[PDB]
Amino acid sequence: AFNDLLQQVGGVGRFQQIQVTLVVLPLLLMASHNTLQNFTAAIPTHHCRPPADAEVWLPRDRQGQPESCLRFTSPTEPCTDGWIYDNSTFPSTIVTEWDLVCSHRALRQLAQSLYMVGVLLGAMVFGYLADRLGRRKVLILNYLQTAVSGTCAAFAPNFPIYCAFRLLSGMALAGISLNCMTLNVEWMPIHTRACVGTLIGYVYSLGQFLLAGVAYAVPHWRHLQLLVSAPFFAFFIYSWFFIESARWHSSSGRLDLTLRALQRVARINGKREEGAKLSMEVLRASLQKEASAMELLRCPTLRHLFLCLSMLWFATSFAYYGLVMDLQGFGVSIYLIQVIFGAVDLPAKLVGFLVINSLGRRPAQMAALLLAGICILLNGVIPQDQSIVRTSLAVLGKGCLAASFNCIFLYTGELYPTMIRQTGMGMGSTMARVGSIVSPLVSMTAELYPSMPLFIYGAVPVAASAVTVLLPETLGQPLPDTVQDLES
Numbered sequence: 001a002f003n004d005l006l007q008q009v010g011g012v013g014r015f016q017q018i019q020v021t022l023v024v025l026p027l028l029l030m031a032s033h034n035t036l037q038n039f040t041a042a043i044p045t046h047h048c049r050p051p052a053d054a055e056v057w058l059p060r061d062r063q064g065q066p067e068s069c070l071r072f073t074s075p076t077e078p079c080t081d082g083w084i085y086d087n088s089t090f091p092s093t094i095v096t097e098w099d100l101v102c103s104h105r106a107l108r109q110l111a112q113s114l115y116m117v118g119v120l121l122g123a124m125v126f127g128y129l130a131d132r133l134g135r136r137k138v139l140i141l142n143y144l145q146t147a148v149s150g151t152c153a154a155f156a157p158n159f160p161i162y163c164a165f166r167l168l169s170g171m172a173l174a175g176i177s178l179n180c181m182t183l184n185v186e187w188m189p190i191h192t193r194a195c196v197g198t199l200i201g202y203v204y205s206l207g208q209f210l211l212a213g214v215a216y217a218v219p220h221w222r223h224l225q226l227l228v229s230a231p232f233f234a235f236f237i238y239s240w241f242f243i244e245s246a247r248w249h250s251s252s253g254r255l256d257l258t259l260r261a262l263q264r265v266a267r268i269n270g271k272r273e274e275g276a277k278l279s280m281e282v283l284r285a286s287l288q289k290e291a292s293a294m295e296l297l298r299c300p301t302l303r304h305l306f307l308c309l310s311m312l313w314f315a316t317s318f319a320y321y322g323l324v325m326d327l328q329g330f331g332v333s334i335y336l337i338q339v340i341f342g343a344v345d346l347p348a349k350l351v352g353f354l355v356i357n358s359l360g361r362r363p364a365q366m367a368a369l370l371l372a373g374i375c376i377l378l379n380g381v382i383p384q385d386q387s388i389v390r391t392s393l394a395v396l397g398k399g400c401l402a403a404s405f406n407c408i409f410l411y412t413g414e415l416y417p418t419m420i421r422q423t424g425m426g427m428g429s430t431m432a433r434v435g436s437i438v439s440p441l442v443s444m445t446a447e448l449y450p451s452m453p454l455f456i457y458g459a460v461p462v463a464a465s466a467v468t469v470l471l472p473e474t475l476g477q478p479l480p481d482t483v484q485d486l487e488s
């Protein structure tokens with residue numbers, strides 16, 4: 001009956017209207033910190049450096065554009081003398097610093113994959129150490145780490161240092177992302193748990209506008225990294241005034257701390273009379289009523305349901321974080337493609353919340369996944385000459401993939417039983433990060449063919465859009481209680 005207590009103290013009061021916004025404000029920067037290897041690691045046009053023994057020194061081909069690997073040995077040799085990058089649009093990036101061109105093309109992908117290898121470990125470690133130390137105690141440490149290892153990478157003199165510090169930044173953000181929602185949904189009432197679940201996805205897709213603005217205001221990569229990883233100091237200085245969630249104190253056993261927190265919340269809300277009316281016996285008599293991750297195995301009815309959902313999660317995340325990168329090659333500047341990839345997410349949700357309720361979950365999911373797969377696969381056929389009909393397919397695929405996220409999140413929840421639903425969505429979201437790890441590794445093979453990555457990104461969602469023909473429909477039904485009554 002804890003919700004009745006929360007309603008007694010005031011329900012949704014000024015305390016919530018302050019702490020909720022102060023905790024959800026630091027998610028305007030996660031979009032910037034995720035898709036940064038588009039403005040901080042761009043690749044400008046480059047050609048070999050002629051020896052200062054003096055124009056006609058480069059074996060140009062393919063419509064006259066100079067080669068990028070040979071230098072006419074005598075007036076067909078590897079460069080070994082540094083390159084001469086252009087400085088008209090990208091004055092400085094990572095690839096300009098450490099010469100990641102024509103022999104070390106895999107290093108950008110290695111950095112982007114090492115940033116995402118340190119989001120899995122983050123979501124694991126800072127999720128295990130959150131319900132054992134405190135939500136606020138972990139928020140403070142993460143707000144600190146994501147700025148003591150995110151501005152010390154903007155001053156790195158080597159490549160491995162940059163890689164390791166980006167890994168640590170990802171490790172911190174992967175704990176901020178969990179603890180935000182976990183702490184935020186515990187001080188709200190029970191009837192407003194879905195109005196705060198669609199606010200961490202409505203302010204999440206506003207970081208892309210901020211990125212398209214900032215990265216255009218500040219082109220250099222060191223200044224950009226520093227200016228994007230600086231405000232976490234301000235977000236950390238005031239991170240001591242947060243109030244710990246009373247439900248965690250209640251679960252841990254210590255009830256006097258819960259009573260103190262509730263009295264403080266009552267004083268803040270302006271209900272001192274009912275706050276002092278609260279006592280120890282009242283709480284002891286009102287809250288006296290108060291799942292293995294391996295049980296998914298050795299149980300066919302659960303394993304058969306887990307495999308399909310894992311495949312759907314993986315395919316969606318893989319296609320998404322394979323498409324949202326490589327904004328170069330559409331004939332239009334990146335500062336205009338970002339503000340179009342981030343402004344097509346409103347219709348992709350207004351239609352997702354209009355097709356699932358009218359037909360179901362299976363048809364909407366399958367349609368979104370297959371249409372995104374086709375729109376992705378069709379770009380690896382049309383030649384790069386077209387530039388008006390080659391970005392529309394990209395924006396359509398991105399919208400369809402966002403709709404796929406928003407539908408699979410609800411479907412996985414409504415599908416599982418009620419006791420294992422907490423550790424089912426966890427194992428389902430974990431498989432949405434192995435996808436983001438293996439997504440940039442595939443883009444390395446673009447050396448073997450100029451379109452094989454685009455073909456790989458197009459076939460996995462299509463091969464996954466045929467898995468939903470094995471899952472039960474769950475529109476207009478009661479949520480299944482146990483594994484026994486889960487039949488149809």
Ligand SMILES: Nc1ccn(C[C@@H](CO)OCP(=O)(O)O)c(=O)n1
Pocket residue numbers: 200201202204205345349402403405406
């Ligand atoms: N758990 C999730 C869910 C969604 N997105 C992508 C995000 C920006 O496109 O989606 C915004 P929305 O689906 O409208 O909430 C993500 O990166 N991680």
